[PDB]
């Protein structure tokens, strides 16, 4: 029978099945109805990014973010938000800053202002994103180049102070094989950071997958969970071709990792995906559940 994957994953002891969205999606088509029926958590695709919220220094705006947070409260959904510190959606005024202390203070103020506005309401903040190169070294974004590698400690310490009850995550992509240097490096660095007292509660795996990659996640996710964070999660999930096999493998990986709290997909219906031609989502363009959705339902019985 037609069922909600969020309700089913909750019945298997996980916290949520979630989806990325924003005001532009919710005011059109069938998105809001499907999200309400089948998902338990929303995340803003773009409205909480740096460009949207702080387009010039100290001059904040929350139009889209408030829309989504208020919608989630109104509609009984959990909220995740981010990314506080990454190189995407980063307005050039930030990446033009040339000195350590200036950028520290700008970064701290950005983190604190966003987290304070929504204090107590947000389950998970993605504090640091896409911090690694594929070889496992740290990505030379403006934060690393100007602050240095202490930017990661600082970002998490600041986030904990702004809202101690949010779960604080680092997230990255291409963490999908236990044999890949990037997956190994984020584990080694998170272990280091935690031993130094950096408050990293979660590793989020950004699973923008090609066909056949699901199987590798079965061993990659427990490797990520070995860094000792209280949580791991799957986010930004889509799969080229949307094979039931790939989706069921990802779900099984989360089921088999005690610290995996849930799974968030990148969107609702295929033609609205940034990767629409790969039909990589769980609903087709008529907003009907696809074979992969039905396979997830079957797998969560």
Q: Tell me whether strands 41-44 and 78-85 are parallel, antiparallel or unpaired.
A: parallel
Q: What is the rounded distance in angstroms from the CA atom of residue 154 to the CA atom of residue 149? A: 9
Strands 16-21 and 167-173: unpaired
Six-digit token string for 33? 């109805």
CB burial readout 259-285, b (16+ within 10 A) else e: bbbbbbbbbbbbebbeeeebbbbbbbe
- DSSP summary character for residue 147: I
- Separation CA 117–CA 94 (nearest Å): 21
Rounded to 5°, the CA angle 8-29-290 comes to 40
Q: How was this structure determined?
A: X-ray
- The vertex-165 CA angle with 26 and 187, nearest 5°, equals 90
**How far apart (Å, rounded) are the C-alpha atoms in residues 172 and 139?**
11
Backbone angles phi and psi of 59, in degrees to 5: -115, 90
Cα gap 245→58, rounded to integer Å: 47
CA gap 170, 143 in Å, rounded: 15
Cis peptide before 83 (omega within 30 of 0): yes
Question: Domain limits of the chain?
Answer: 1-301
Task: Measure the CA–CA gap between 119 and 104, rounded to whole angstroms.
Answer: 22
CA angle 85, 42, 81 (to 5 degrees): 15
Residue 252's alpha-carbon distances to 57, 210, 214, 217, 275, in angstroms, are: 44, 17, 10, 9, 24
247 phi/psi in degrees, rounded to 5 = -65, -45
CA distance 247 to 213: 10
Could you tell me the CA-to-CA distances from 220 to 120, 159, 267 in Å, in that order? 32, 27, 23
Resolution in angstrom units? 1.0
Cβ–Cβ < 8 Å for 126, 171 = yes
Rounded CA-CA distance 49/251 in Å is 28
Cα–Cα distance measured from residue 247 to residue 299, given in angstroms and rounded to the nearest whole number: 10
CA distances from 38 to 41, 107, 118, 265 (A): 10, 36, 25, 12
End-to-end CA distance of the chain: 11
Asked if 95 and 57 count as a contact pair (C-beta separation under 8 A), the reply is no
Q: What are the backbone dihedrals phi and psi of residue 276, each rounded to the nearest 5 degrees, phi first?
A: -50, -40
CB 203 within 8 A of CB 257: no
**Where is 236: in which H helix or E strand?**
strand 231-239
Distances (CA, A) of 104 to 21, 127, 200: 30, 14, 18
Tokens linked to 158: 């600041």
Residue among 143, 124, 80 nearest 230 (CA): 124
Dist. CA 249–CA 259, nearest whole Å: 17
Query: CA–CA separation, 72 vs 125, rounded Å?
Result: 15
Within the chain, how many helices (H) and strands (E) appear? Answer: 13, 8
What is the rounded CA–CA span in Å between residue 29 and residue 37?
14
The alpha-helical segments, DSSP class H, found in 1-128 are 5-11, 23-26, 31-38, 50-53, 63-74, 92-95, 100-117
């Amino acid at each position: 029978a037609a069922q909600s994957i969020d309700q089913l994953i909750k019945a298997r002891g996980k916290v949520y099945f979630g989806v990325a969205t924003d005001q532009n999606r919710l005011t059109t088509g069938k998105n809001a109805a499907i999200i309400k029926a089948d998902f338990g958590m929303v995340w803003p695709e773009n409205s909480m990014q740096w460009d949207a919220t702080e387009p010039s220094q100290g001059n904040f705006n929350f139009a889209g973010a408030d829309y989504l947070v208020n919608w989630a409260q109104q509609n009984g959904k959990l909220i995740g938000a981010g990314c506080l510190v990454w190189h995407n959606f980063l307005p050039s005024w930030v990446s033009s800053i040339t000195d350590k202390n200036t950028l520290i203070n700008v970064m701290k103020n950005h983190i604190t202002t966003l987290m304070t506005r929504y204090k107590g309401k947000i389950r998970t903040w993605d504090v640091v994103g896409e911090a690694f190169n594929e070889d496992g070294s740290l990505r030379q974004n403006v934060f690393l180049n100007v602050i240095g590698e202490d930017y990661i400690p600082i970002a998490f310490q600041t986030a904990r102070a702004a809202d101690p009850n949010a779960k604080l995550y680092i997230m990255d992509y291409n963490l999908d094989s236990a044999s890949y240097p990037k997956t190994q490096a984020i584990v080694n660095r998170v272990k280091q950071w935690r031993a130094a007292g950096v408050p990293i509660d979660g590793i989020g795996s950004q699973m923008h997958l090609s066909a056949g990659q699901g199987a590798g996640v079965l061993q990659a996710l427990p490797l990520l969970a070995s860094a000792g964070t209280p949580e791991v999660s799957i986010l930004m999930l889509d799969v080229a071709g949307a094979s039931p096999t790939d989706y069921v493998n990802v779900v099984n990986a989360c089921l088999n990792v005690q610290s995996c709290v849930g799974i968030t997909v990148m969107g609702v219906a295929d033609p609205d995906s940034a990767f629409a031609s790969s039909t990589p989502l769980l609903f087709d363009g008529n907003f009907n559940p696809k074979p992969a959705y039905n396979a997830i339902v079957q797998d969560l019985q």
